[PDB]
Structures are given as structure tokens and as C-alpha cells.
Amino acid sequence: YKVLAIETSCDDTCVSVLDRFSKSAAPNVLANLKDTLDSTKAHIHHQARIGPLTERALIESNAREGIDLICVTRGPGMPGSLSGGLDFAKGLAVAWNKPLIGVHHMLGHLLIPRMGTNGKVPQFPFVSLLVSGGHTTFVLSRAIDDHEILCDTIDIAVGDSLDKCGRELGFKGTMIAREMEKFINQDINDQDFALKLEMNMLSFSFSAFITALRTNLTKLGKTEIQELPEREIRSIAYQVQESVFDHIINKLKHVLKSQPEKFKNVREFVCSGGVSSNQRLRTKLETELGTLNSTSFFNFYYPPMDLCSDNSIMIGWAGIEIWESLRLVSDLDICPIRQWPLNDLLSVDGWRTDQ
Amino acid sequence: YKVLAIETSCDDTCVSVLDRFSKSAAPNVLANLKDTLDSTKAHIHHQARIGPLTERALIESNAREGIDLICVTRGPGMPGSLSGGLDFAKGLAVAWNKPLIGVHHMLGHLLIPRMGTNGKVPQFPFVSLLVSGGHTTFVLSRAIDDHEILCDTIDIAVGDSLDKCGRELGFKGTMIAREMEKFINQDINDQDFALKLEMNMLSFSFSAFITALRTNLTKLGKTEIQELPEREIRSIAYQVQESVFDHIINKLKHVLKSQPEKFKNVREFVCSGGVSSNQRLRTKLETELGTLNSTSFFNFYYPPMDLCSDNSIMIGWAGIEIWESLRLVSDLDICPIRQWPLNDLLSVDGWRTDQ
Ligand SMILES: [Ca+2]
Ligand SMILES: [Ca+2]
Ligand SMILES: [Zn+2]
Ligand SMILES: [Zn+2]
């Protein structure tokens, strides 16, 4: 019971060998990642990486003959890109004569925080916020097959919104979003508070913030970010970050108080993704949700950045949960599904019982 | 030394397990084929077939652990379609820890008639005519890496030309071309001979024959094929087939007599493909080329229709020739090449020495 896992949906080519010692613990043997170089197609990249990225991951891992289950991403994404990992996984499966479990990409993200505790700590009736550079979704899980989208982005994601409006302020590094947070947190008190930069049910909107900041900048004193002093650009950065997060909080507060019947048994909140790394977002979440009466008490869990960002360990974990708790295996004639819905996880063709 | 071979370039999904008993003989263990149903994308078809088409081909064959070399089509064709076989072959290779040899599709066709005699009877300095529904090429091989295109189609192929102009005559079956030959050969003497239907260096042209037949039909008596008697449509079918073949012969006669230095050591002619099944084409080839003085004497070889039409056995054979006579193996980072030239066989990236 050594799980070979693959992630080939976006730009990250991931290969990870897991070790399931018993049905109570799951330490990770090996984990590889190769991202697309940018100033080369994603499908061609994955197709050229997967092969040599698995042999090295098998040479460095326990054994090449010790693999018992092959997990791969059948999930949402580019068909051509994820066919690279899928057809390769079929090749491993046929050659070793072992099962294949085609995993939903988003299911990996939602199930990943359960691996460390062997699906115990984030107990089945739970609620989750997926704040990344690509996602912005508020999901309620009732079981591994049941998932309810309570609030999702109709515009762009937080990562993009904070990176786009952050670029207007002057920041231009590798991870634009966190550099702004580090600038605000270098000296939180030294700000020009005088610079008052002041700006349906199941939806989030972010594409307006960049447009609203530019109008706020043209109305107020100066627009030239290069000439602007450090204290003034810090009161702007604080206020933009405050408004972006106030919108998320206000929509989570709206969801919880509107239908508390769905949240009667939720005892754990999971904030996963790139933006979860923000200490203000964390403190805002824990402050507001913990004081409201109608809202049920929570226990906030912030997973590591390695597991949060697209990796293969999550596919290997979600596959473990499906092979064990549902006892299902994907058919060998499996094909990529571009816009595979999460509720349409077991409705679509390809499932075969192992029980 | 059991070769797993794959063909996923066009519409035929092929998987074949070969048995190399010694470096003197090569009997074929298993061979599978699944073609695209037509009134479903070719890439999606190959991607869904390859997996289950290999497991059954491995269950019915000798063993699943007995495979020593993995041959696959890297050759010309649809990138998405042939990625299905390639990524799958990588999966087998990585899993079994065995070599991979990415084969040129056209090299399979040219090398296939050597398998039965273990590369002896069609001796190295040879000339070949590839007359199929997709090809119409006159190739000279000097070694397995050296190939000279002496005459090729600039329009459409013989198979298409005979099927398109045959359809104008009334035939509408599964294999249109051969049905016309069978109609001409049912009673070759009963024809209306009075119906005289009368119609640069390295090139063949066929798209003109259909247009020239229609003009010949409008000029002569009647066009309505339904009302037309069987004897008259037989003199048309004979004359169209005679003109199509006379053009091929005249261009082969031109090539040989223009540069006889290239043909000083050629002792064998190989006519392979769908149109090679025609007895008149065969008799025309053997008559004309055998009476001309400047042209070197030939020994005509007509391979079976199974090996001629797109299959995986040829990839497994061409791979055997490359692994043995050249001692080369393709790298695991291999990717599909859409318009891979035959002279650019070893010039392109991906080759690694096994010696
Ligand atoms: Ca099926
Ligand atoms: Ca290379
Ligand atoms: Zn993702
Ligand atoms: Zn072909």
C-alpha cells in the first residue's frame, strides 16, 4: 500500500510516492515538482516532465515494484495538459497490474488538511474557505462525495486582485501579494491616517477593487507611486487589504446567519490557499465569526503552503479516502474532464467498485 | 526480449506483443486493433482504447512482466492523438524500468516487409512504392537511417483518387477502390471498346482524374450512371484505372532511366499499401520495368494487407532494427512530432545510445 500520485492540471508537474503503513497513519515518502518557465506550452511541458520526474521519484523512494495504487488528476483543467499525467498513469497501472483512481482536482484541496490526522481532526460536518490565486470559494462538506458551494467568485480571485492592485501601488516581485503584507507589517503604526481612502447571496466580486483604487487615487492628492512617501502608500495598502478582506468576512457572515441549519454541526473552519498566509485575514476571520451569536463556534485550521498550493500529495490522499471509505476505482478507459463539477464527482462515467 | 509495440497516429489504435526468440527470427505473439466509429474525436478514442487494449493484449500474450522493450509511434501525425500512445508507453517504460524507442510512422511501413525474413530478403540497397489511401511515394533506402524520396504525391493519394472517381461511376461500399477492380475482373472481355474515354520529375498528381472523368462523361453519350449498361461502365472503369496506373508507371520509368547510378545495386522492388492488392497494377509494374534496358533487374515483393495497413507490428519491427543495428533508445522526455521528416529521423532530439 504505497500510493503513486500525479498532478498535471495547471502549470505544476507533480509526482509523489506515499506510504500507508496502516489504516491509521500516512507519512509521505517522496514528492517532486517542476513548474512552467515563463518570461513553452503547458501540455508539452507536463508530457516531457512526467516520465523522468517519476523515475527519479521512484529511484529515490522505497521501490519501483512496491507501488499498490495509482492516483492521478482526472479533475478540472486543460484536457491536453492533464492527459499527460492520465495516459502516463494508465501506463503505470497496466504495467504493474494495479488500480487507478482518477481524482477531482478541487477534492484534493478540500481533503488535503485531513492527511496529517488520518481524517479525524477536520471532522466530516465542516466548512472551508479556499482563498488562492485561482480560487475564492466557501465550501461545506457533509461526506467525501457531498460538497456544497455556499459562496464563490464571479469575477477574479483574491491572489489576482491583490497582485493587480498591488502592482498599481509599486510592488513587482515574484509573489506580489505577500510583499504588500510585509510592507504594511514592517511598521503598522507609521501611516498617514488622514489619507481616508474610502471605497448577491452566494457570490464574491474582486475585479472592482483595482478600478476603485485608481478612481480613489485620481480623486485624492497624487497618483505617482514613485514620488509618494512610504507612510502614505502604507495607509493605502492597509485600506485596500482591509476592504478586500471585509468583503470576504461580510459574505461569510451573511451565509452563516442566513441558513444556520446547515451549520448546526460545524465545529471546524479550514482557510487554505495562498492568501491564508496573511496574518490580518486570519485575525479578521477569528474575531468576527467568534463574536456572532447565531453562528456556531469554530476551530480554525491553517494548512502549510506546500499542501495548499497545487501538489500531488492531495490527489494521493483523496484517492486513499475514496479507495477506503467509498471503495471505488476508476476504469482504464478514463479520459480528461475540462469543467468537471464537484457535485458531479460520482455521477460521471468511469467508476468501478473494489468491494 | 519481448517487444510491446503501439500505433496511435491516425484512426487505428494498435497494440502488439512480439517475440524475439533470437537475433535470426521474430514470430508475433499478440496483435490488437480498434478503429474510430464513423457515420467521436481520434485523440479521445486512442486515449480511451490504449489502456484496456494493452491489458487484454498482455493477458492473452505470454506475460505482463516478460516485456523487455517498449516501441511506440513518435512519427508523423496528430500530436494529441499520438500523445495518447506515447504518454502511455512512458508509463509502461517507467513502471517496468525498460527502454523506450520512439518510431517514425513511415519507417514502420518501409521496414515492415523485412520482419518475415529477419532483414535479409529485401536487401539494404532497395527501392519501394507506397501506394495507399493516404500515401503515394517512391522511396530508395540505402540503410535504416538513409531514405531518398524519389517521387511523391503533390495532390491526393491513389486510394482517394480511385474511391472519389469510382463514386462518380456508382460504387459506394466500405472499400470503394477494390470493388471497381472486382467489377472489371468479373468479365474483362465484355466491354464497349467503342467507348474511347481518352484523357515534374519527383511528383505525382491525382486530383485531376475525377475532374477529367466528369468532362469525358459530359462530352460522351450519357452521364447518368444508374441508366448506363454494365459493359459501358466497365470500359470506363478499365480506362480510368489504366490511366491512373499508366501515370505511376511513367513516373517510375522516368526516375529509373534519369538517374541509373542510384539504382546500380537495387535487386528488389517493394509495392506496399492498399492499392498493391490490385492484380493489374502488379502486372503493369512487372511488365514495363522488366523490359527496359537501362533499368536494373528487379524482384517484386507484395506484403500482406494486415502489415500494409496501419498496425503496431511494424513499429515493433523498426524499433528492433534501430535497437540492434543502430543501438539507440529514445529519452523519457520524448514528445510528439507532427510533421517529422524521414531524413530528420536521427537529427531531432530524443536519441540516447544503448551501446
Ligand atoms: Ca466504460
Ligand atoms: Ca533532453
Ligand atoms: Zn489548483
Ligand atoms: Zn499510415
Numbering used by the authors:
A (entry chain A), B (entry chain A): 33 to 71, 80 to 239, 251 to 406
Task: Please quote the authors directly.
N6-threonylcarbamoyladenosine (t6A) is one of the 15 universally conserved tRNA modifications found in all three domains of life. With the sole exception of bacterial initiator tRNAfMet, t6A is present at position 37 of the anti-codon stem loop of all tRNAs with ANN recognizing anticodons (N being any nucleotide). This modification serves to strengthen the codon–anticodon interaction and promote translational fidelity by the ribosome. Toward this end, we show that yeast Sua5 and Qri7 (the mitochondrial paralogue of Kae1) are sufficient for t6A biosynthesis in vitro. In summary, the eukaryotic t6A biosynthesis system functions first through Sua5, which generates TCA using its adenylation function and then secondly through Qri7, which binds to TCA to conjugate the threonyl-carbamoyl moiety onto directly bound tRNA substrates.
To shed light onto the structural basis for the unique functional properties of Qri7, we solved the structure of yeast Qri7. Qri7 exhibits the prototypical bilobal structure with its catalytic region sandwiched between subdomains I and II. Crystal structures of Kae1 orthologues (like ASKHA fold proteins in general) display variability in interlobe closure, and the Qri7 structure is notable in adopting the most open configuration reported to date for a Kae1 orthologue. Projection of conservation onto the Qri7 structure identified a large contiguous surface emanating from the catalytic cleft. A portion of the conserved surface was accounted for by the expected binding sites of TCA and phosphate coordinating metal ions. The binding of acceptor substrate (tobramycin) in the evolutionarily related TobZ crystal structure identifies these unaccounted for conserved surfaces at the tips of subdomains I and II as the possible tRNA substrate-binding surface. Application of crystallographic symmetry to the Qri7 monomer structure revealed a dimer configuration with a large (2087.5 Å2) hydrophobic buried surface, which is partially conserved across Qri7 orthologues. Remarkably, the Qri7 dimerization surface is the same surface used by archaeal and eukaryotic Kae1 proteins to bind Pcc1, a dimerization module within KEOPS and the same surface used by the bacterial orthologue YgjD to bind YeaZ. We confirmed that Qri7 forms homodimers in solution with a dissociation constant of 60 nM by equilibrium analytical ultracentrifugation. The R104A and K130A mutants displayed a dimerization dissociation constant of 3.0 ± 0.3 μM and 2.5 ± 0.2 μM, respectively. These results confirm that Qri7 forms homodimers in solution through the same binding mode revealed in the crystal structure.
